[PDB]
Design a protein around this ligand. Structure first.
Ligand code: GCP
Ligand code: MG
Length: 169
């Protein structure tokens, strides 16, 4: 009944779609399918409010288009996703944050840093590295596994709460 527009961004391969599908389907999509839907709706009660989440699951490597920016500009909050076994994707968070600041023309956009694939061994990005980056940005850091669902609902609900901290809903 209250709509929240959420946008999921991050490098190609970090699990943006798998995260969204876990929230939507309670299932782990184990293969890469480039034709998967990118626009989802999820109705859930968060702190006693009935929330209709309108989720845009973006393409990580899509190049500039006015249309791409226009779709992102509708977002009220952003999940910025890297994978904990993908150092480049972690470093690339700088690019996605700058992109969001530009598209929204704002330094205070609701945002959660998400470190996905926590089910995997020998991670290459330590939790303390991610905590430090999120601290530098003034945003929460949440670790997730789209495979097990660990942290997935936390990431989306925390983003909803970050939006409420920024604007009346
Ligand atoms: N072990 C594990 N694998 C995952 C996890 N999340 C996604 N993957 C796997 O990573 C690969 C890429 O997942 P996908 O969700 O398509 O990534 P994406 O970020 O949406 C790719 P694009 O930006 O091109 O749309 C898939 O093989 C998928 O199953 C995870 O939490 N754990
Ligand atoms: Mg995807």
């Amino acid at each position: 009944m209250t709509e929240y527009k959420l946008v999921v961004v991050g490098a190609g391969g970090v699990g943006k779609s798998a995260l969204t599908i876990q929230l939507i389907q309670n299932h782990f999509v184990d293969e890469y399918d480039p034709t998967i839907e990118d626009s989802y709706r999820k109705q859930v009660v968060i702190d006693g409010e009935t929330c209709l989440l309108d989720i845009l699951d973006t393409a990580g490597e899509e190049e500039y288009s006015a249309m791409r920016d226009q779709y992102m500009r509708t977002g009220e909050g952003f999940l910025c996703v890297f994978a904990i076994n993908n150092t480049k994707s972690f470093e690339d968070i700088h690019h996605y944050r700058e992109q969001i600041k530009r598209v929204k023309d704002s330094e205070d956009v609701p945002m959660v840093l998400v470190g996905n694939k926590s089910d995997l061994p020998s991670r290459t990005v330590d939790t303390k590295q991610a905590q430090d980056l999120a601290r530098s940005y003034g945003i929460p850091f949440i670790e997730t596994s789209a495979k097990t669902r660990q942290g997935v609902d936390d990431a989306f609900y925390t983003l909803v709460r970050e939006i409420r901290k920024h604007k009346e809903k």
